[PDB]
Every structure is written in C-alpha cells, then in structure tokens.
C-alpha cells in the first residue's frame, strides 16, 4: 500500500463521450493496455503510469495539467493544452501554435517540459480531467520501461531519443523526442458531480474558460491544487531542497530578529502581540516587553478577517491597540496601524513558488503552503519597512577582505562616531545579503507609520 495497484478500478463514465462503448468495469491494467502501453509484469520501479493522491501531493512540483480537444482520432487534428499555457495542434498527416505532425510536436513537448521542470522535479505528473483524447494521445509522445538514469548524469531519466537510442533527465534532454516514464492522475476519479468548469469556478475567479485546451489544463491543475492544498492541508509532508530554501529561512530569522528588536528600541512598546504560528518562539528573547502569543495556523484559502482574529469572547480580553502587533506571515484582510508585518507576495516568480488557486500561490519550502493572493489594500494603515542594519554589539573584529563601508543605513556606535569598524561592515554586508535574499524570495515587510530609524541613534550615548 505505497503505489497505486494496476488492479484498482477506474471509473470510465468521463471517457464514454470520446470513447463510446467503453466497459463500465475497468482496471488501470486494462486502461494502460488500451492506451497502447505494455508493462510486461515488470518489477523495475515503474509499477503504474497512474499514481495515488498521496503520491501526487509529494510530487506537486511535477504537476502539469494536460488536456486534449478534438479539432475537427486518426481522422482529425488534436489540440494539446498544458498548464504552461501552451497549445500545440498535432495532425496525423494563451499561446496557440499551427498544426504539425507528431514527429515535430513530440520534440516541442520534451523541450517545454524540460525547461518548465528541470529546476522543480525529477519527474512529470500529468494532471488530467480525463475524457479520452488525452489518454489516446500519449502513445504518440510517451515511451515507458524500467527506471533508468540520465546518459550524462545520476538523475533519473525523463526523456528518450529515437535518434541516439539514449535517456536523459530534464537538464540533458536537448534534441530528445519522447517523454519517458511520465506519471499521471485523473482528477475525475476523485468523485465530483458535473463538469470541470462548474467544479473549478466554485473555488476560483482568476482562470477563465476561453474554450481552448490550455484553459482546461490550467483549470484541472487549479482544481487539483484546491483539493490537495486549500480544502485539505498536510504540513507533515517534507519536500526536497531544490534552491535557496536554507539561506531564505535563515535570512527570515535574521530580518525578523533585526526589525522587531529595532521597533522595541525605537518606540519602547510595553506589550507585543505575536499573532500566527502556534509553534512561534520570542524572536527577541532579551527585549524588555510583555510578549503575548495568539495561535493562528497559516490560512490556505482566504486571508483571516482581523474582526475574527481580534474578536473579544469575554471582558478583560487583550487590548490589541496597546503596544504593537507582530504578524510574521500571518495573512489578514487589513492590518491594524500598530503592526510589524511580513507578508509573502504570491505574484513572485521562483522555483519555490508554484501557481495556485484564485490568485493564491503554492509556496513549497520544506513544507507546502497555499497562500491567499497578495492584496495591497491589506497594508493601508502601514508603510513599507525601509532597509536598515542596527547593532549594539561591540566594535571588535575577532578570528574576509575589506573596502571601508559608507552607508547612512548602518546604525552602529562606529558609524555614529563617523567611521564604520571592520566587524560592523562585515555584519552589515552579510545582513544586506540575507535581506535581499528574503525580498527576492517574495517576502514584503510593512511597519507602523511612526517607525523612524533616527530614534535608534540614541540607544548608544
Ligand atoms: O489509446 C487509446 C486508443 C488506442 C487505439 C486506438 Cl485505434 C484508439 C485509441 N485509447 C485510450 C484508452 S481507452 C481506448 C482508447
Ligand atoms: Zn542528466
Ligand atoms: Zn483556477
Ligand atoms: Zn563597529
């Protein structure tokens, strides 16, 4: 009970308009056979082209929605749509390409999947709302067999070349013509009523239906992300390191300590209200302040309503207007004016951040976090937090080659005295690096309007 048994039943009702007469009684084994593939009773790490929900959720970085529409089955041209927004027309002889034979279409499919996936995943998972033409199209661009390694590296093979008779991963596949050992999941097997559009549109207003294959491909993946990461949420599932996950997370800890430490020193709040992750620890353990925690899990669907977070259930309940509120990746509709905020910007392009449901994004860094669409109006009571580095640490090198640092934003005794010491120059440059990492990863920082770094210079005298 890890992989999907090929002897599992497959409901064929979705198939029966493209494939009239299809048996009601159907297994994956029989379906794979009718798709023109032979598994040869093979114990070589590829037991089934189709995978479980649980397996798909572990391989979310690999999801490519895929849809095929009859254009006029051997008779007629097929429109191939992918969640990348690409439409290819294959002839048997929003990006929309003219009709070409399979021998050239399959080359474009490998190039497209390789460019999309090489920095994301070791595989492809085709996310289907299966009606028949998508499954019958696979024999024309897919080959299967035993698990293999790349000819040029140690990564599992994802592509095959009929020219060279060799196997490549996504990194090494230029000129390859076949997708090799793809995986796939039919969303329609999950038990929905009515068509794709009617189910997608319950949850999402951002993906229209232009009645083209890529639109269905996008809607199919969106619906799948909704089901697996919005309505259902599993934070136990770990995901491999593929990028700067570790640097970004370190940077996040450093910036959070820096900004909160400086807010307490500058404005001397007697109480801090720490709203969000119930596992959260004091980010400034030495600070004078009354530190009060409020538990809120990461919201995957809609931003929290500040009315419901701060709702008073009895008298003598905490005054959130006293001191300052820390919302560190706690996404709310509208922050109060007395807030310090870190808010993930869902629009950011990275390998960590996958497109999500209804303008949200699926941010995958150790764990998967569906994040509600970034909204600028949430920040109306605040301003953007400007970059600064602050330290009360002694000017003292210890233990890196130097250009003397000149910066208005290096808030240290040494800079107060007109000359930045080597230690604080090294720390400044490391912190500016951490800060830039975190920003470019898509985090945005917001602060109460009265916040002024000028107030920090008098914390040394
Ligand atoms: O792969 C095919 C297929 C095979 C041969 C021919 Cl001539 C047409 C279609 N499918 C999808 C699986 S169910 C039966 C149709
Ligand atoms: Zn390789
Ligand atoms: Zn959608
Ligand atoms: Zn110094």
UniProtKB/Swiss-Prot annotation:
N7-MTase domain span: 239-461
Positions of the UniProt region annotated as GpppA-binding: 357-371
Compartment annotation: Host cytoplasm; Host endoplasmic reticulum
Positions contributing to Zn(2+) 15 binding: 200, 204, 207, 222
Binding locations of S-adenosyl-L-methionine: 274-280
Chain's role: Plays a role in viral RNA synthesis through two distinct activities. The N7-guanine methyltransferase activity plays a role in the formation of the cap structure GpppA-RNA. The proofreading exoribonuclease reduces the sensitivity of the virus to RNA mutagens during replication. This activity acts on both ssRNA and dsRNA in a 3'-5' direction.
Name the record gives this protein: Guanine-N7 methyltransferase nsp14
Organism field: Severe acute respiratory syndrome coronavirus 2 (2019-nCoV)
Residues of the full protein shown: 5949 to 6449 of 7096
């Amino acid at each position: 009970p890890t992989h999907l048994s090929v002897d599992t039943k497959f409901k064929t009702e979705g198939l029966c308009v493209d494939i009239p007469g299809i048996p009601k009684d159907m297994t994956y084994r029989r379906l794979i056979s009718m798709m023109g593939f032979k598994m040869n009773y093979q114990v070589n790490g590829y037991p089934n082209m189709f995978i479980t929900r649980e397996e798909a959720i572990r391989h979310v970085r690999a999801w490519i929605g895929f849809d095929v529409e009859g254009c006029h089955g051997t008779n007629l041209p097929l429109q191939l749509g992918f969640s990348t927004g690409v439409n290819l027309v294959a002839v048997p002889t929003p990006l929309m390409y003219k009709g070409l034979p399979w021998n050239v279409v399959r080359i474009k499919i490998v190039q497209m999947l390789s460019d999309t996936l090489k920095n994301l995943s070791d595989r492809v998972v085709f996310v289907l709302w299966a009606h028949g033409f998508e499954l019958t199209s696979m024999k024309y661009f897919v080959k299967i067999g035993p698990e293999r390694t790349c000819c040029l590296c140690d990564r599992r093979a994802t592509c095959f070349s009929t020219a060279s008779d060799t196997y490549a991963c996504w990194h090494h596949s230029i000129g390859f013509d076949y997708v090799y050992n793809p995986f796939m999941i039919d969303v329609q097997q999950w038990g929905f009523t009515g068509n794709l559009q009617s189910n997608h549109d319950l949850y999402c207003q951002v993906h229209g239906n232009a009645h083209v294959a890529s639109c269905d491909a996008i809607m199919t993946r969106c619906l799948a992300v909704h089901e697996c990461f919005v309505k259902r949420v599993d934070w136990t599932i770990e995901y491999p390191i593929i990028g700067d996950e570790l640097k970004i997370n370190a940077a996040c800890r450093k910036v959070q300590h820096m900004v909160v430490k400086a807010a307490l020193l500058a404005d001397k709040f007697p109480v801090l209200h720490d709203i969000g992750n119930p596992k959260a620890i004091k980010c400034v353990p030495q600070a004078d302040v009354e530190w009060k925690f409020y538990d809120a899990q990461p919201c995957s669907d809609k931003a929290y309503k500040i009315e419901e977070l701060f709702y008073s259930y009895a008298t003598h309940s905490d005054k959130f207007t006293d001191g300052v509120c820390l919302f560190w990746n706690c996404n709310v509709d509208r922050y109060p004016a007395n807030s310090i905020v870190c808010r993930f910007d869902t629009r950011v392009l990275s390998n960590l951040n996958l497109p999500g449901c209804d303008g949200g994004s699926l941010y995958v860094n150790k764990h998967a976090f569906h994040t509600p669409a970034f909204d600028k109006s949430a920040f109306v009571n605040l301003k953007q937090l400007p970059f600064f580095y602050y330290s009360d640490s002694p000017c003292e090198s210890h233990g890196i080659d130097y250009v003397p640092l000149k910066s208005a934003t290096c808030i240290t005794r040494c800079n107060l005295g007109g000359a930045v010491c080597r230690h604080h120059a090294n720390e400044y440059r490391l912190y500016l690096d951490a800060y830039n990492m975190m920003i470019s990863a898509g985090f945005s920082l917001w602060v109460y309007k009265q916040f002024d770094t000028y107030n920090l210079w008098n914390t040394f005298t």
